[PDB]
Design a protein around this ligand. Structure first.
Ligand SMILES: Nc1nc2c(ncn2[C@@H]2O[C@H](COP(=O)(O)OP(=O)(O)OP(=O)(O)O)[C@@H](O)[C@H]2O)c(=O)[nH]1
Ligand SMILES: Nc1nc2c(ncn2[C@@H]2O[C@H](COP(=O)(O)OP(=O)(O)OP(=O)(O)O)[C@@H](O)[C@H]2O)c(=O)[nH]1
Ligand SMILES: Nc1nc2c(ncn2[C@@H]2O[C@H](COP(=O)(O)OP(=O)(O)O)[C@@H](O)[C@H]2O)c(=O)[nH]1
Ligand SMILES: Nc1nc2c(ncn2[C@@H]2O[C@H](COP(=O)(O)OP(=O)(O)O)[C@@H](O)[C@H]2O)c(=O)[nH]1
Ligand SMILES: [Mg+2]
Ligand SMILES: [Mg+2]
Lengths: 429, 49, 104, 439, 34, 439, 429
């Protein structure tokens, strides 16, 4: 069971670089590709993310994407950038300019052929591919357009494979680009059509984690990418390591997706604490379940308390007692049924992985299909309506030949998704 | 019957030995099957002659 | 070689790829013919054998609960009832053709 | 002869079987390497272990089991575990892709293509087993593999084995402890197959075992290993009659008839006593009357089904150790007088007794205290309707909006399956209250 | 292999009556026909 | 006396002959130079090797084999191999240029200029043997030489030696794995000649050997060497009845009348078990019943053909080792009690058994495990219609618009030969289904 | 079992020189003609390409041809120039002048007599030869003209023996002359019914092989010629070395020619790894087969998307198991059967040789007969029609004794060949 990852754009590529650093640290793989792990559990299922070469070098199952070659060059310069295969760096000459039309129709299309070649060959290199992973930013041009164009042609070739997308939706007060609403709206419907599970990321709540939970004095993009890499590695803990109650991406999808269009998840991590408060914190299953459900701990800028939890998933890692890891879920359901959907009894799935991240007695990743995603989608919808009403920046997108009708298509699909979540929130027994 | 039991034990030990021998046999076969290239693969290239 | 002459009273080998990387063939089962001793020949046994009566088919006098069908629901279409080309066969008839001691 | 074939479907079944074979090797003095060292207490050529361990002719014993699972983690972990030398490389089937908590996927897509080689392993065990008594299948219907593939295997075993006993020791979902959301779907869908092709289905939910360990064992934080050890103890107590000398020797098929009153009524609760810790033990005079009372105690069952909510239809007590018929009959008389334990009117006898002289043996590190005598419970009661009612009400709640049904359709199920399973559960519980009604 | 068993068999010299002996033709050096 | 003349035609024939002769030398204690160094327990003047090795006045033994090939690399490698002094300088006929995967090339142009020399070598082989049992021909019809030159050699041997037994362990094309593209043409053309001039032909395809070695022999990457070693083991097991003593001694021509119901019905399934690695050899108690069941299993078959898709018209089991006739009867009885495998209505007996007391060997360089007993099935079944229908459908697809037909017709073969051989195979499959039909 | 080779033109002479260098290295023959190989397998079949003299020197079975003596001097002054027989250097005084007419009717004829004298002498000197090999470029004057005249005369003289020619078809994007259409057409309509089998070479594909597979700095003609040499060595390896699955030129011809006029093949090599990505990729049979069937790995510049494989042939060298070298052919035949045709099932021929090229533990040469090979013929025909429609550059050819009817017949034959390839390009099921 193998999953091959593709990281697209500047944001996606740096997130993937941090994620591969995390995974290499997990499996005891140094940047030169050798294996200096301290246990054979890191070697038993190292084939999930790494492919062994003739010399024993463990090449990551990674495909890199961009239009600006500077992102590829910086990734290669990264501390673990020497791990990736040189031919897996596919790049262009001119950037996307935050333009979804160039990322999806003109520059991406003229470049995605070699990308599909690399993805196809690496997929066939796997004995039995468990899934495809993608990391990208919806606000950007080459991350959103090229990533969506990737998943569109990967879904058609592998209909039953798990599409594991990590899309970084821009936030209003964290925004640094004006065509971000356009790119996000044009990418949301593609994500809906061509993703088994889309797990959103927002820099607003990432910075919230860095400033209030971790109390970092100056968090850069590296800390945000580390927080994303946390969940990116924790979702496959049962895949890579044994456990009392194993799971996988498809089990998570079946337990978290009640209907095909409802596959947008809001996530979290635990444990996470500041440097000064870490000697005062006694790690326990109770503390982990306290932090995993905290609204502030969520790395999405959509308030959990406003919506209702369709489904929840607890990927616990480490040696812990099973009746209490289940009880911390049943108890929270019983005392907070108002936070959960009535007609879906037992909203919480729990899974146990034997091996936690080294240095941690136990950790947990939370996966939540809350009905509050429609709020963070409706914010983007409001921004998109405001920009689209006055033909703002439409000439840049129509220069490549993309259509006002396709803008309306994206808007209608996003509104349909938002109203879908709202109707399933307010539906009663 | 007890001597046939002894011969079954002897066959078991012989099977231990054959299984071990096949183990390093398969290891050596994998080592030979692994593909590598030395300098003479590239010596024809990168020269402007 | 049509299935409904080849497997009139036998489960067809439903093919599955796993277990082979090449063309799958078939997998024999432990389904036993009912006792048909030769007429007049003694019960000669070279070695201990599995008794036929201990493996009498469950569809013998299986009670009909739905008035007309011994099958409870359509998992009979998964276990008993098999589709063989243009013909449909049921192993529930095996219980009718066998005796309480698994004899024709 | 008198062998029994153990089948372990899914993660729950595989781990339960791991604990069961732990306990079996401890009982029969078999090392993990697969050989039995010479011991003065056990005589030479004493092949009482062959009911579970086929003897290879070279001094090694191989268990008569089949670890079937669609996901390679558990079987590979067994292959890298302590009993890698004990367990055969075959009968250890590994799938490549998990059923993913989907009964439809485990019953129609991957089960349909792994079950025939599973049957290969089953037949390769059965031909060796000259006097096979039956198949003991361990699985949890709440998962995907254990529900779908387990039901498919147990369903196809019927045609090619006939009247062979089917002891399905099934872990149903608990009222509160839930590790899945589609668990009601899987349980309801597999319940019909259990009804049709299960000779005796034993209730083994997790919350009741957790509460039992928290209360009696003074263990604040039990786990799957604890519950699997307790399940293995119950299994060994049930199967010890055909393994050791006993006053009332019973087989797998002996309690079949005494436990199943009607063809569609074969679900059955279970319990064990004295399930106490070492600290607890030396403060109690664990007599036969005491252990019988603790068995009949409503807290002591392995399922969250209160017998006071229904009529007992057929109880069966398996005593083990220095137990005496004097004491068992005194205990039965006291239990019958004890008036919350009311038997249905049309079943006046209602009692089955099996006495075996072999006391239980504790595994090293096990929480069970070593005892001279211990009694297990396997009892069919009309109160079983509790769990079925709660599970199919959860099924109704999920099915009102047709949630999570797109997955079951996507791995090859028509909603006719869901519907018929629904009225099958409804009619089953109607049968429960109907047999509970007085004449 | 079948050395001490054959020696004790020929020392005991049981008469040829069915049931007392078995596997005599399996107790052999080799089966190379001449 | 009782000699059997080996005729290895083509590349595949040469490889399987090398494996067979290595195995035979290990059987008879013949060193690569061709002599027995010193054997005390093995009595002197004991000649059980006469059927495969002819003595010389110097005490050196020469195999009774003809390595006939049209191209020189394989024969030259065999010449330079380990058996330099063992293999005869003559009887090792090598041509100038290969048949180019062309049946017409191997049968009309280069085959004609070498068949006379091959027959001279065969006569020099046969005049030495005063009790020649028959000719064991090893070839693959997929290639050019093994099809065309094999056809020509068999055609002339038939008229030269009358009704001498001909056992052709032939490698027909596999269902989907091929090492050539004109392979269906070669197979279809060669089958016509083989029908008239082949007493018994034995399935020896490649996919079944690959799958069997991957599953049971537990090596990830088997190759032609392993396939040839398994083929040699099968051949030695079949021919050992006339080499060593046994309860049921059988010759090559003895099963000719028992395995061939009709003159056109001579293509036979082959099975061999226990073909297991030493990893599981001690794990499994390989009794007579177990090995017979594994042999009868279609999974253990040595061709990718389905016995359950046909009816066993006849079977011939060869037990090798310490197999008791009582155990043989028990295995046969438990096989007849089975339902999945069924005989035709007109052949109630359908069974032949031959017991040899010599245990099978283990060859260094091979992955087989030493076992005190084994058994090889040679069985005529109607299932061969499936593989012949597959290959002739491939032939019809190829010959529909006459692809690769100019290559064949250029060498000198009639253009109508393709068609006429195709009606031959049509009649062959027709009589297959009609002999499988009931009365 | 031997092949006698001829080099025509400057391109053909350089390619043949590189091929002879590769063969001498494989057989352990230093430029002075002696033998220093460290294996008996190098001497057991060294007679395929080399003839032993009185002093033990191994003279290559090579005939060199060019009207320009400059390339003759260059090849004899090269590092392996002393290897060739002095009398086999056959040259004229005046060059072919990039004229097919001059190289085929006026100046080629006056030298083809001595050329055939030399080839006949070599053929009868050696014992029983598999056939003749030729290397040339169709865009030249003497490589195309004299090459085709040589092929015609050798078909006159030895039709019994196989004929294999390596023709470097020019491409417009590599075109360094203007009479590529005329020369290429006048050569191909000869090779259709003269050459027994003709695999195609394009410098356009040779250039980007050095990029998408080698990523090397300075690609030159000598760099390009090594690819052709390696594929020739892989083609004829099995005649010189033993193997589990043996093959020869007639076997490939039978397995790759369904109809007599369909003998133009598309060819490739594997592995083609870069210095930077050498250790990164783990070479195995799967990677070898994927590189064989990769579109960009071909050394002829015609797109295989637009055509369907009539037949395919994989000639593996090295130490590999047989079931996983047939299972990967099965794997491709199943995965991307749209490349293949249904009326000819199981389109893949396979051969195994135990001796790989120096520097490889596994290697393979791929020869494919596809319906896409007519793309180069179509493009050359379009250029030919453009040039011939206005009678451009036709006076040069008509002044050398040739008439317009030769061009008309060449165009007719080219169109017929294109059409008969395009017969089966439709993706029928
Ligand atoms: N008593 C006991 N129950 C277990 C154990 N492990 C898992 N379970 C039960 O199994 C349920 C999880 O579903 P499983 O049936 O184990 O899943 P599976 O069998 O691997 O099949 P999939 O869901 O497709 O992976 C949990 O709710 C537990 O109640 C165990 O060790 N002991
Ligand atoms: N078992 C086995 N079969 C082989 C071997 N070599 C070739 N074959 C068979 O030969 C068939 C293909 O024919 P060829 O490769 O032409 O070999 P051939 O039949 O002897 O004919 P030629 O080699 O052309 O003389 C394949 O289908 C293989 O089954 C081998 O080493 N072992
Ligand atoms: N978490 C995180 N966000 C990033 C990173 N780099 C960029 N972003 C976000 O991505 C948005 C712009 O995306 P952009 O760089 O245009 O994506 P691209 O065009 O595909 O390369 C900004 O609003 C950033 O907040 C990163 O390393 N980590
Ligand atoms: N691969 C390769 N191509 C060459 C070489 N020399 C010339 N060419 C090609 O051949 C074409 C010219 O052919 P030319 O040498 O004039 O043919 P000639 O007149 O018969 O000698 C040019 O377009 C080149 O691309 C070489 O050494 N290697
Ligand atoms: Mg599982
Ligand atoms: Mg050959």
């Amino acid at each position: 069971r193998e999953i091959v990852s593709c990281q697209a754009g500047q944001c996606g590529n740096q997130i993937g670089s941090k994620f591969w650093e995390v995974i290499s640290d997990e499996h005891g793989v140094d940047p030169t590709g050798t294996y200096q792990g301290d246990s054979d559990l890191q070697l038993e299922r190292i084939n999930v993310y790494f492919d062994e070469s003739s010399g024993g070098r463990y090449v990551p199952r990674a495909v890199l994407m961009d239009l600006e070659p500077g992102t590829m060059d910086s990734v290669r310069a990264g501390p673990y950038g020497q791990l990736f295969r040189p031919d897996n760096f596919i790049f262009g000459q001119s950037g996307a300019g935050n333009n979804w039309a160039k990322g999806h129709y003109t520059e991406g299309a003229e470049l995605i052929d070699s990308v599909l070649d690399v993805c196809r060959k690496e997929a066939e290199s796997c004995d039995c591919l468990q899934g495809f992973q993608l990391s990208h930013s919806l606000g950007g041009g080459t991350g959103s357009g090229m990533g969506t164009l990737l998943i569109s042609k990967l879904r058609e070739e592998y209909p039953d494979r798990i599409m594991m997308t990590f899309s970084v939706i821009p936030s209003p007060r964290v925004s640094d680009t004006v065509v971000e609403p356009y790119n996000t709206t044009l990418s949301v419907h593609q994500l809906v059509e061509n993703s088994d599970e889309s797990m959103c990321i927002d820099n607003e709540a990432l910075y919230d984690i860095c400033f209030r939970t971790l109390k970092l004095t100056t968090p850069t993009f590296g800390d945000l990418n580390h927080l994303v890499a946390a969940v990116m590695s924790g979702v496959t803990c049962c895949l890579r390591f044994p456990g009392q109650l194993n799971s996988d991406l498809r089990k998570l999808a079946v337990n978290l997706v009640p209907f095909p269009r409802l596959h947008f998840f809001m996530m979290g991590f635990a444990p996470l604490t500041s440097r000064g408060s870490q000697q005062y914190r006694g790690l326990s299953v109770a503390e982990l379940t306290q932090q995993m459900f905290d609204a502030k701990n969520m790395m999405q800028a959509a308030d959990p308390r406003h919506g209702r939890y369709l489904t929840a998933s607890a990927l616990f890692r480490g040696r812990m007692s099973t009746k209490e890891v289940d009880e911390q879920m049943l108890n929270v359901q019983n005392k907070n049924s108002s936070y959960f959907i009535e007609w879906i009894p037992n909203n919480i799935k729990s899974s146990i992985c034997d091996i936690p991240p080294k240095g941690l007695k136990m950790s947990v990743t939370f996966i939540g299909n809350n009905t509050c995603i429609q709020e963070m989608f409706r914010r983007v919808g409001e921004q998109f309506t405001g920009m689209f009403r006055r033909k703002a920046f439409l000439h840049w997108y129509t220069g490549e030949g993309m259509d006002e009708m396709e803008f309306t298509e994206a808007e209608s699909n996003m509104n349909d998704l938002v109203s879908e979540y709202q109707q399933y929130q307010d539906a009663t027994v | 019957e007890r001597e046939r039991r002894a011969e079954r034990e002897q066959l078991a030990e012989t099977q231990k030995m054959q299984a071990e021998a096949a183990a390093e046999r398969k290891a050596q076969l994998d080592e030979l099957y692994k593909n590598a290239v030395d300098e003479d693969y590239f010596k024809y290239w990168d020269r402007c002659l | 070689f049509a299935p409904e002459e080849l497997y009139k009273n036998c489960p067809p080998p439903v093919l599955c790829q796993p277990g082979y990387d090449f063309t799958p063939i078939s997998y024999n089962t432990f389904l036993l013919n009912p006792q048909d001793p030769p007429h007049g020949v003694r019960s000669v046994q070279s070695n201990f054998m599995h008794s036929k009566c201990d493996y009498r088919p469950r569809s013998y006098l299986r009670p009909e609960e739905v008035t007309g069908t011994s099958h409870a629901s359509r998992h009979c279409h998964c276990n008993e009832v098999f589709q063989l080309g243009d013909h449909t066969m049921d192993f529930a008839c095996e219980g009718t053709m066998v005796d309480h001691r698994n004899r024709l | 002869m008198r062998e029994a074939i153990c089948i372990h479907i899914g993660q729950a079944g595989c781990q339960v079987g791991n604990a069961c074979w732990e306990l079996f090797c401890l009982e029969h003095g078999i090392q993990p390497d697969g050989s039995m060292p010479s011991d003065k207490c056990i005589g030479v050529e004493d092949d009482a272990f062959n009911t579970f361990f086929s003897e290879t002719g070279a001094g090694k014993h191989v268990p008569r089991c089949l670890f079937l699972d669609l996901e390679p983690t558990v079987v590979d972990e067994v292959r890298t575990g302590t009993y890698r030398q004990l367990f055969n490389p075959e009968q250890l089937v590994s799938g490549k892709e998990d059923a993913a908590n989907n009964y439809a996927r485990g019953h129609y897509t991957i089960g349909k293509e792994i079950v025939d080689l599973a049957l290969d392993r089953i037949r390769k065990l059965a031909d060796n087993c000259t006097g096979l008594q039956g198949f003991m299948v361990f699985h949890a219907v709440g998962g995907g593999t254990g529900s779908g593939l387990g039901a498919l295997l147990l369903e196809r075993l019927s045609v090619d084995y006939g009247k062979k006993s089917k002891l399905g020791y099934t872990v149903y979902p608990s009222p509160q402890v839930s590790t899945a959301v589609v668990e009601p779907y899987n349980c309801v869908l597999s319940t019909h197959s259990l009804l049709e092709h299960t000779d005796v289905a034993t209730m083994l939910d997790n919350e009741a075992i957790y509460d039992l360990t928290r209360r009696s064992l003074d263990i604040e934080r039990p786990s799957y290993t604890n519950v699997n050890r307790l399940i293995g103890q119950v299994v060994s107590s049930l199967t010890a009659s055909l393994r050791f000398d006993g006053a009332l020797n019973v087989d797998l098929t002996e309690f079949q008839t005494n436990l199943v009153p009607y063809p569609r009524i074969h679900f059955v609760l279970t319990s064990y006593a004295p399930v106490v810790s070492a600290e607890k033990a030396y403060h109690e005079q664990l007599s036969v009357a005491d252990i019988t009372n603790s068995v009949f105690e409503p807290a002591g069952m392995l399922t969250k089904c209160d017998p006071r909510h229904g009529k007992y239809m057929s109880c069966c007590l398996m005593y083990r150790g220095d137990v005496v018929p004097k004491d068992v009959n005194a205990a039965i008389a006291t239990i019958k007088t004890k008036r919350t334990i009311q038997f249905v009117d049309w079943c006046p006898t209602g009692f089955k007794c099996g006495i075996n002289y072999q006391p239980p043996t504790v595994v090293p590190g096990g929480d069970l205290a070593k005892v001279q005598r211990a009694v297990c419970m396997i009892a069919n009661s009309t109160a079983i309707a509790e769990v079925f009612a709660r599970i199919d009400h959860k099924f109704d709640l999920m099915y009102s909006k047709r949630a999570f049904v797109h997955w079951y359709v996507g791995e090859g199920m028509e909603e006719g399956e869901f519907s018929e399973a629904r009225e099958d559960l409804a009619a089953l519980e109607k049968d429960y209250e109907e047999v509970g009604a007085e004449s | 292999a079948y050395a001490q068993s054959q020696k004790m068999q020929k020392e005991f010299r049981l008469p040829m009556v069915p049931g007392l002996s078995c596997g005599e033709e399996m107790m052999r050096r080799n089966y190379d026909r001449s």
